[PDB]
Design a protein around this ligand. Structure first.
Ligand SMILES: [Cl-]
Ligand SMILES: [Cl-]
Ligand SMILES: [Cl-]
Ligand SMILES: [Cl-]
Ligand code: NA
Ligand code: NA
Lengths: 105, 105
């Protein structure tokens, strides 16, 4: 056993979701961590938020690492405001905390 | 055994990747398919492309479905051109083909 720290990708919503559904989902892609014990939290302008946050169970990858995702289900109005959103993943086995930041358009 | 068809999400690049690395990676998120036998292909304006396409092995999800991803590693110049990109996933077990389209900004 040699624990590996996670790596993040904070991605903007698909233009069709904003232009059709008027919703803007931010996807946080957490990959490469082992073992699977992970906690993902969100914050709007360095202030914690839990509303419309969808956390998914960890998935087993073929390179024997684990991967999970976190979804922040924002409205298009809130996403077009220009507020800073941060996805932060805490991984206790490796004692590491990785962060990713996205700004709006 | 009752095969399930995959569902796609075609996502744009993170603004920081375009503004810092001058590269624009398009992520195709294929989820919910069972069994894992899947083929993902890309096309630029309905014309097949294989250059800078990174396909990943299938991952086992906790709901007993499989999920995979496909990355189209475009340059920021090619992404800002306005060309239509289509991610299409073929799933032989369910005999289904799902498509997702993204347009540029
Ligand atoms: Cl990225
Ligand atoms: Cl990814
Ligand atoms: Cl979507
Ligand atoms: Cl997703
Ligand atoms: Na998204
Ligand atoms: Na992407």
């Amino acid at each position: 056993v040699e624990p590996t720290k996670p790596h993040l990708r904070l991605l903007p919503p698909s233009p069709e979701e904003i232009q059709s559904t008027s919703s803007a989902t931010l996807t946080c892609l957490i990959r490469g961590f082992y073992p699977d014990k992970v906690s993902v939290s969100w914050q709007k302008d360095d202030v914690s938020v839990s509303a419309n946050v969808t956390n998914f169970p960890t998935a087993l990858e073929q390179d024997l690492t684990f991967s999970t995702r976190s979804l922040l289900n924002l409205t298009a109005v809130e996403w077009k405001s220009g507020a800073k959103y941060t996805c932060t993943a805490s991984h206790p086995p490796s004692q590491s905390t990785v962060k990713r930041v996205i700004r709006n358009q």
